[PDB]
C-alpha cells in the first residue's frame, strides 16, 4: 500500500512502430 | 483559516531565493497553518522525489502530531495565476486523507507589502475572498538579506547535512 502513488498524464528520428 | 507569520515568511522567502523558476512548498498544521516547508524548485512534473518527500514528512510529522493540510505553488512567470494539473492532483490526494485541505497560489504580481486561496469543498478548487505585523516582519527580514541560508528539500538531496525544518529562521522571527 503506497499512499502517495501519483499518475501524471515529428521530432526528427522518432517513430512508434515496434520495428524488429 | 488563518495565516501564520512564519508560514508567509518562509513561503515568500523561497519564492525570492529562486525567483525565475517555479516553486512549490508545503504547509503543515497540527484551520490554522503552523509551518511552511520550501521543498522544491525546477520542473516539478516528476513523481518520485515528490512521493518520497510526502512519505518522509508524514513519518516525521507523526512524531510531533502534525498533519500537512496544505499546499502552495508559485509559477515562474508573474502574469499567471491558474491551478495547473499537478497541484490539483496533489491537493486531491491530500484531501483524500484530510478532506479539508486548502490550496494556495501566490499572485506574485505585487510581491511587496498576494494570496489567491482556493478551496475544493466538492468544487474544483474554487476561489474565496481575503480573510499586518507579519507584513512588516517579511519586509524587514527580506531586506535583512537572509534568504541565502534557507534550505529546501532539493538542497537536502545533495548535502544531507542540512535541516529542512531550518529552526534558525523560526527562532529568528521569534526574537522579532
Amino acid at each position: 500500500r503506497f499512499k502517495w502513488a501519483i499518475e501524471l498524464s515529428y521530432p526528427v528520428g522518432y517513430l512508434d512502430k515496434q520495428v524488429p | 483559516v488563518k495565516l501564520t507569520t512564519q508560514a508567509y515568511c518562509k513561503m515568500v522567502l523561497h519564492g525570492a531565493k529562486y525567483p525565475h523558476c517555479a516553486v512549490n512548498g508545503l504547509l503543515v498544521a497540527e484551520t490554522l497553518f503552523v509551518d511552511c516547508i520550501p521543498l522544491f524548485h525546477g520542473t516539478l512534473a516528476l513523481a518520485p522525489m515528490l512521493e518520497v518527500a510526502l512519505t518522509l514528512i508524514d513519518s516525521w510529522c507523526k512524531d510531533h502530531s502534525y498533519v500537512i493540510a496544505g499546499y502552495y505553488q508559485a509559477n515562474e512567470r508573474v502574469k499567471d495565476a491558474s491551478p495547473n494539473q499537478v497541484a490539483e492532483k496533489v491537493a486531491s490526494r491530500i484531501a483524500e486523507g484530510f478532506s479539508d485541505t486548502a490550496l494556495i497560489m501566490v499572485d506574485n504580481t505585487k510581491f511587496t507589502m498576494t494570496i489567491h486561496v482556493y478551496e475544493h469543498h466538492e468544487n474544483r478548487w474554487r476561489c474565496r475572498d481575503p480573510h499586518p505585523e507579519a507584513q512588516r516582519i517579511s519586509a524587514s527580514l527580506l531586506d535583512s538579506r537572509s534568504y541565502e541560508t534557507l534550505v529546501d528539500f532539493d538542497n537536502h538531496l545533495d548535502d544531507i547535512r542540512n535541516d529542512w525544518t531550518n529552526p534558525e529562521i523560526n527562532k529568528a522571527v521569534l526574537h522579532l
Partner: protein, 275 residues
C-alpha cells in the same frame, strides 16, 4: 585579491545565474581595475549586463552596452544584447525585426533564432515554440542545450514520451554524467508501465555506479523496486530479486544517514520498515 576575477570566471563557466552577487562584484571590478585587467573586461560587461537585467536595475545596462558599442561598432553580439534590452521592456516586434535583420545579413547565425524562441515563449505560447525549435533542430543538430530545453518543454506539456527520445539523443553522446540517466529514469518511472520501471531501476543504478554518492538515484531505485514488489504481474523471481535490491539499498541509506548523524535516523528507519 584577484580571486574576484576567478570567481566571476567560474560563474561564467558553470552557469550559475543568481544575479545578486554578480552585479556587486561586477560594479566593483568595472572600476579602474579595468585598465589593470587588460583586454579581458569585455566578457565581464557581457556578463554583468544580463545579471543586471535579472536584478531589475536597467541603469548599468546602457553603460555596459555603450562601452561595448564604442569598442565593437559593427558587431552582432551587442545587437543581440540590444534585442534583450528591448524584450525586457517588452518591445517584441522591434526585437523581431532586429533578429530577422542580423539573420538576414548572416543566415548561419543561431542566437537570433534562440532569442526569437525566448520571445515566443515569454508571450505564453508554447506549441508554436516547439515546432520552431524542431525546425531549427532539423538543421542545427548537435545543439545539446536545445535538446535539453525541448525535453523540459515537452515535460511541462505533459508529453513524457518524446522527452525520453531527446534524453536518448543527449546521453548517447556525453555518456559519462549521471544527471542525464537519472532524469531519464525519473521520466520513465513517471510514465508508468512495468516495461518502463524495469528501465527506471536500471538507469537509476547506472547513474549511481558512475557517481556512487548521488542520493536521488538511491531513493529512485528503492521506490521503483518497492513498487515492483506489489504489482501482481511478474513471476516470483522478479519480486524476490527486487526485495533484495530494496533491502540492500535500505542498508546503504542507513549507512549514509549514520554518517550524517555526527532524529533523522528515526524517520528514515520508519520509511524503511513501513513496507
Amino acid at each position: 585579491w584577484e580571486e574576484m576575477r576567478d570567481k566571476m570566471r567560474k560563474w561564467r563557466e558553470e552557469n550559475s545565474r543568481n544575479s545578486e552577487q554578480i552585479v556587486e562584484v561586477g560594479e566593483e571590478l568595472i572600476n579602474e581595475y579595468a585598465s589593470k585587467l587588460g583586454d579581458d573586461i569585455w566578457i565581464i560587461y557581457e556578463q554583468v549586463m544580463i545579471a543586471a537585467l535579472d536584478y531589475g536595475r536597467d541603469d548599468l545596462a546602457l553603460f555596459c552596452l555603450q562601452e561595448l558599442r564604442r569598442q565593437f561598432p559593427g558587431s552582432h553580439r551587442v545587437k543581440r544584447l540590444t534585442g534583450m534590452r528591448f524584450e525586457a521592456m517588452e518591445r517584441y516586434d522591434d526585437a523581431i525585426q532586429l533578429y530577422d535583420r542580423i539573420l538576414q545579413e548572416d543566415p548561419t547565425n543561431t542566437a537570433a533564432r534562440k532569442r526569437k524562441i525566448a520571445i515566443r515563449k515569454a508571450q505564453g505560447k508554447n506549441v508554436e515554440a516547439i515546432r520552431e525549435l524542431n525546425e531549427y533542430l532539423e538543421q542545427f543538430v548537435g545543439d545539446q542545450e536545445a535538446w535539453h530545453e525541448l525535453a523540459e518543454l515537452y515535460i511541462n506539456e505533459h508529453d513524457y514520451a518524446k522527452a525520453a527520445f531527446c534524453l536518448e539523443e543527449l546521453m548517447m553522446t556525453n555518456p559519462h554524467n549521471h544527471l542525464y540517466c537519472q532524469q531519464y529514469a525519473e521520466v520513465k518511472y513517471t510514465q508508468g508501465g512495468l516495461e518502463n520501471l524495469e528501465l527506471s531501476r536500471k538507469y537509476f543504478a547506472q547513474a549511481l555506479k558512475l557517481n556512487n554518492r548521488n542520493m536521488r538515484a538511491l531513493f529512485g531505485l528503492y521506490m521503483s523496486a518497492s513498487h515492483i514488489a506489489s504489482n501482481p504481474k511478474a513471476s516470483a523471481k522478479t519480486k524476490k530479486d527486487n526485495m533484495k535490491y530494496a533491502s540492500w539499498a535500505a542498508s546503504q541509506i542507513n549507512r549514509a544517514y549514520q554518517f550524517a548523524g555526527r532524529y533523522s535516523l528515526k524517520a528514515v528507519e520508519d520509511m524503511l520498515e513501513t513496507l
